Write an enzyme that holds these catalytic residues in place. Structure first.
Site, PDB file in Angstrom:
ATOM      1  N   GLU A  88      15.754  -7.334   9.205  1.00 55.30           N
ATOM      2  CA  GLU A  88      16.568  -8.242   8.509  1.00 55.30           C
ATOM      3  C   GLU A  88      17.524  -7.654   7.442  1.00 55.30           C
ATOM      4  O   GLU A  88      18.886  -7.975   7.133  1.00 55.30           O
ATOM      5  CB  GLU A  88      15.517  -8.855   7.135  1.00 55.30           C
ATOM      6  N   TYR A  89      17.477  -6.257   7.048  1.00 56.96           N
ATOM      7  CA  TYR A  89      18.275  -5.374   6.124  1.00 56.96           C
ATOM      8  C   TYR A  89      18.911  -4.249   6.837  1.00 56.96           C
ATOM      9  O   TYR A  89      19.919  -3.618   6.048  1.00 56.96           O
ATOM     10  CB  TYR A  89      17.420  -5.013   4.851  1.00 56.96           C
ATOM     11  N   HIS A 104      -6.393   8.427  17.622  1.00 56.29           N
ATOM     12  CA  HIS A 104      -5.148   7.931  18.343  1.00 56.29           C
ATOM     13  C   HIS A 104      -5.274   9.288  19.239  1.00 56.29           C
ATOM     14  O   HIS A 104      -5.302  10.603  18.752  1.00 56.29           O
ATOM     15  CB  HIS A 104      -4.007   8.017  17.492  1.00 56.29           C
ATOM     16  N   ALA A 139       7.815  -1.971   4.607  1.00 59.13           N
ATOM     17  CA  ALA A 139       7.638  -3.471   4.246  1.00 59.13           C
ATOM     18  C   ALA A 139       6.989  -4.035   5.833  1.00 59.13           C
ATOM     19  O   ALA A 139       5.811  -4.483   5.770  1.00 59.13           O
ATOM     20  CB  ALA A 139       8.970  -4.180   3.960  1.00 59.13           C
ATOM     21  N   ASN A 146       0.845  -1.079  -0.031  1.00 53.20           N
ATOM     22  CA  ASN A 146      -0.163   0.072   0.085  1.00 53.20           C
ATOM     23  C   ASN A 146       0.825   1.212  -0.005  1.00 53.20           C
ATOM     24  O   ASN A 146       0.589   2.134  -0.855  1.00 53.20           O
ATOM     25  CB  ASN A 146      -1.065  -0.053   1.085  1.00 53.20           C
ATOM     26  N   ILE A 147       1.748   1.279   0.972  1.00 52.62           N
ATOM     27  CA  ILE A 147       2.618   2.435   0.913  1.00 52.62           C
ATOM     28  C   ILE A 147       3.808   2.742  -0.032  1.00 52.62           C
ATOM     29  O   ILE A 147       3.763   3.675  -0.653  1.00 52.62           O
ATOM     30  CB  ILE A 147       3.376   2.437   2.536  1.00 52.62           C
ATOM     31  N   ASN A 187       3.113   0.589  15.760  1.00 49.53           N
ATOM     32  CA  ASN A 187       4.378   1.356  15.358  1.00 49.53           C
ATOM     33  C   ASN A 187       4.521   2.736  15.826  1.00 49.53           C
ATOM     34  O   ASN A 187       5.466   3.071  16.249  1.00 49.53           O
ATOM     35  CB  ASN A 187       4.297   1.395  13.528  1.00 49.53           C
ATOM     36  N   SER A 213       8.355   0.953  10.025  1.00 52.11           N
ATOM     37  CA  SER A 213       8.018  -0.171  10.674  1.00 52.11           C
ATOM     38  C   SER A 213       8.763  -0.177  12.076  1.00 52.11           C
ATOM     39  O   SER A 213       9.500  -0.926  12.232  1.00 52.11           O
ATOM     40  CB  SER A 213       8.321  -1.563  10.139  1.00 52.11           C
ATOM     41  N   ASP A 256      10.936  -6.570  -2.980  1.00 55.72           N
ATOM     42  CA  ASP A 256       9.537  -7.005  -2.444  1.00 55.72           C
ATOM     43  C   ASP A 256       9.352  -8.384  -2.795  1.00 55.72           C
ATOM     44  O   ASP A 256       9.065  -8.843  -4.022  1.00 55.72           O
ATOM     45  CB  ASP A 256       8.321  -6.157  -2.565  1.00 55.72           C
TER      46      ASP A 256
HETATM   47  N1  LIG Z   1       4.889   4.468  11.432  1.00 55.67           N
HETATM   48  C1  LIG Z   1       3.503   4.364  11.269  1.00 55.67           C
HETATM   49  O1  LIG Z   1       2.812   5.357  11.645  1.00 55.67           O
HETATM   50  C2  LIG Z   1       3.070   3.215  10.318  1.00 55.67           C
HETATM   51  C3  LIG Z   1       1.854   3.755   9.588  1.00 55.67           C
HETATM   52  C4  LIG Z   1       1.413   2.724   8.408  1.00 55.67           C
HETATM   53  C5  LIG Z   1       1.833   1.500   8.396  1.00 55.67           C
HETATM   54  N2  LIG Z   1       3.316   0.993   8.849  1.00 55.67           N
HETATM   55  C6  LIG Z   1       3.864  -0.052   8.729  1.00 55.67           C
HETATM   56  O2  LIG Z   1       4.601   0.351   7.194  1.00 55.67           O
HETATM   57  C7  LIG Z   1       4.734  -1.140   6.551  1.00 55.67           C
HETATM   58  C8  LIG Z   1       4.352  -1.157   5.329  1.00 55.67           C
HETATM   59  O3  LIG Z   1       2.954  -0.932   5.418  1.00 55.67           O
HETATM   60  P1  LIG Z   1       1.855  -1.162   4.192  1.00 55.67           P
HETATM   61  O4  LIG Z   1       0.333  -0.774   4.558  1.00 55.67           O
HETATM   62  O5  LIG Z   1       2.269  -0.601   3.095  1.00 55.67           O
HETATM   63  O6  LIG Z   1       1.862  -2.781   4.071  1.00 55.67           O
HETATM   64  P2  LIG Z   1       1.305  -4.087   2.917  1.00 55.67           P
HETATM   65  O7  LIG Z   1       1.109  -5.404   3.790  1.00 55.67           O
HETATM   66  O8  LIG Z   1       0.330  -3.286   2.235  1.00 55.67           O
HETATM   67  O9  LIG Z   1       2.889  -4.043   2.030  1.00 55.67           O
HETATM   68  C9  LIG Z   1       3.950  -4.423   2.451  1.00 55.67           C
HETATM   69  C10 LIG Z   1       4.779  -4.977   1.712  1.00 55.67           C
HETATM   70  O10 LIG Z   1       5.943  -5.209   2.264  1.00 55.67           O
HETATM   71  C11 LIG Z   1       6.221  -6.572   1.722  1.00 55.67           C
HETATM   72  N3  LIG Z   1       7.456  -7.292   2.620  1.00 55.67           N
HETATM   73  C12 LIG Z   1       7.427  -7.531   3.952  1.00 55.67           C
HETATM   74  N4  LIG Z   1       8.345  -8.004   4.458  1.00 55.67           N
HETATM   75  C13 LIG Z   1       9.221  -8.086   3.479  1.00 55.67           C
HETATM   76  C14 LIG Z   1      10.736  -8.405   3.643  1.00 55.67           C
HETATM   77  N5  LIG Z   1      11.009  -8.870   4.894  1.00 55.67           N
HETATM   78  N6  LIG Z   1      11.363  -8.045   2.546  1.00 55.67           N
HETATM   79  C15 LIG Z   1      10.797  -7.254   1.672  1.00 55.67           C
HETATM   80  N7  LIG Z   1       9.763  -7.102   1.498  1.00 55.67           N
HETATM   81  C16 LIG Z   1       8.779  -7.330   2.220  1.00 55.67           C
HETATM   82  C17 LIG Z   1       5.148  -7.215   1.587  1.00 55.67           C
HETATM   83  O11 LIG Z   1       5.293  -8.385   0.640  1.00 55.67           O
HETATM   84  C18 LIG Z   1       4.285  -6.423   0.954  1.00 55.67           C
HETATM   85  O12 LIG Z   1       4.165  -6.124  -0.384  1.00 55.67           O
HETATM   86  C19 LIG Z   1       4.244  -2.287   7.987  1.00 55.67           C
HETATM   87  O13 LIG Z   1       5.045  -2.988   8.674  1.00 55.67           O
HETATM   88  C20 LIG Z   1       3.239  -1.487   8.693  1.00 55.67           C
HETATM   89  O14 LIG Z   1       2.883  -1.929   9.974  1.00 55.67           O
HETATM   90  C21 LIG Z   1       3.892   2.150   9.942  1.00 55.67           C
END
Ligand SMILES: NC(=O)c1ccc[n+]([C@@H]2O[C@H](COP(=O)([O-])OP(=O)(O)OC[C@H]3O[C@@H](n4cnc5c(N)ncnc54)[C@H](O)[C@@H]3O)[C@@H](O)[C@H]2O)c1
Ligand SMILES: NC(=O)c1ccc[n+]([C@@H]2O[C@H](COP(=O)([O-])OP(=O)(O)OC[C@H]3O[C@@H](n4cnc5c(N)ncnc54)[C@H](O)[C@@H]3O)[C@@H](O)[C@H]2O)c1
Lengths: 235, 235
Positions: free
Chosen positions: B65-66, B195, B58, B12-13, B166, B81, B30
């Site tokens: 991991e990275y 929130h 991600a 999504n992001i 997060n 994250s 990804d």
């Molecule tokens: N800080 C904040 O306020 C905040 C807000 C929204 C989302 N987030 C976090 O950001 C991250 C991404 O959110 P999203 O909504 O886009 O998620 P999403 O699930 O829609 O997309 C995440 C993508 O990351 C990929 N991915 C996961 N682990 C991976 C890895 N180890 N190596 C390579 N690719 C990997 C997945 O296959 C997926 O396509 C999540 O961890 C979420 O919790 C944080």
């Protein structure tokens, strides 16, 4: 202790900056005649060639007076007397010069917060209403109930309250002055000042309530300074 | 359109970042098998030598991991994250490496705000209580009244709600995890998530209420990116 800086205004904020900050060298410019402490007291305003950052904590008038020159230098320029920008002419001129400037301007949040969110979604902001609630005593009034003492634009408030209105002007710089409505209330049930910033946007609605015990502004500046070289940046 | 970047996670992001951001070149990693659009799809995780900024969007697992490798590169590293840091061991290790790193780490505020204030007065913070109020439906519950579904530390919440937490972890990074108390409430009168961050400090008390309609997080990242080169910095 790294950088050499120029601090404009050695008042409440300026002295606290020198007191708390760690600078290798400090130039200071302030019309006052107080005896300088740990600063190189400039007699004529100028921007020494070894200055990497210029901090303004003097007055809105100071912003209009020295900004032209400062922007000609390759320095970080932190401004807190933002009410100066409520002046359309100056505002237009300032940013006009900036485009051709080797400098970088920072507007720390100062006495309020939530500007991380606001600057992130600025284009989607429908309106921002900022309310400042103060003890009647601070206004020299005796009231039995809360009373509105002012409601209008940032420009109008800055004229009637030459003191305050900086926080509202910074918000104005971010979203556009026409979207900011300022309300000042004198409330007999209040011991101290409170700032409530309500944001309505296409991305969501936000409310930031600030009740300081301006110590926050000093630390706001120190963080901007710390962030210039830090490897860990928040907000 | 300036910089070349690496985006970890094309969900999504990540897709929104590529969609909205303007980059001259985009590397993306990804595990998914979706057909890449305007990105150079890496098969093996790595940090190309022409990358100036790495953006993680991600997962917490990805951060663990990275991060080691990424920190070996002279890049801006933006992380969202942050729940990964609720892990003391990893947290200790991450910042240990950072001190010896040519990189710079950014923790944008993401889904919340007021982190400008919080990072400014972090040392004076007594406690931070963060409450997330959600519609029971989002929890698969049917309730006649508001109910607390969790109360405790950020580490405990991240375990039970691997999803969320997060925002609380970022706050934890700023003030210290022991000072953050998380409360999650299911309220039948609520249409969407809210929130509320309440901060008590020796400098003052602050409350930030966030009601998003995560679009905010995407724009939070874009602002961090924009700020890397901008001449006008807010917050
Ligand atoms: N800080 C904040 O306020 C905040 C807000 C929204 C989302 N987030 C976090 O950001 C991250 C991404 O959110 P999203 O909504 O886009 O998620 P999403 O699930 O829609 O997309 C995440 C993508 O990351 C990929 N991915 C996961 N682990 C991976 C890895 N180890 N190596 C390579 N690719 C990997 C997945 O296959 C997926 O396509 C999540 O961890 C979420 O919790 C944080
Ligand atoms: N952005 C915010 O949230 C915020 C918060 C607090 C204060 N402020 C502003 O910051 C400024 C400094 O605040 P303070 O409390 O330290 O004020 P202060 O009056 O205690 O000190 C200001 C100093 O500036 C000097 N000065 C004024 N004009 C000058 C000029 N043109 N050239 C050189 N020196 C000059 C004065 O002689 C004085 O010593 C004020 O304009 C104030 O309104 C902004």
């Amino acid at each position: 202790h790294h950088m050499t800086v120029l601090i404009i205004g050695m008042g409440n904020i300026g002295k606290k900056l020198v007191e708390l900050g760690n600078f290798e060298k400090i130039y200071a410019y302030d019309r006052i005649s107080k005896d300088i402490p740990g600063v190189v007291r400039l007699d004529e305003f100028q921007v020494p060639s070894d200055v990497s950052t210029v901090v303004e904590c003097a007055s809105p008038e100071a912003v209009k007076e020295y900004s032209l020159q400062i922007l000609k230098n390759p320095v970080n320029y932190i401004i807190i007397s933002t009410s100066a920008f409520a002046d359309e002419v100056f505002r237009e001129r300032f940013f006009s010069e900036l485009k051709n400037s080797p400098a970088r301007v920072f507007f720390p949040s100062g006495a309020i917060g939530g500007l991380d969110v606001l600057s992130s979604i600025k284009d989607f902001v429908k309106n921002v209403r900022i309310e400042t609630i103060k003890p009647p005593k601070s206004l020299g009034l005796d009231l039995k109930g809360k009373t509105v003492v002012f409601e209008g634009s940032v420009e109008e408030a800055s004229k009637l309250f030459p003191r305050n209105i900086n926080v509202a002007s910074t918000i104005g710089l971010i979203v556009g002055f026409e979207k900011v409505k300022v309300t000042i209330v004198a409330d007999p049930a209040m011991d101290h000042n409170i700032h409530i910033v309500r944001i309505s946007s296409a991305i969501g609605n936000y409310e930031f309530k600030i009740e300081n015990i301006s110590m926050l502004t000093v630390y706001s500046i120190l963080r901007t300074l710390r962030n210039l070289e830090s490897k860990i940046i928040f907000g």
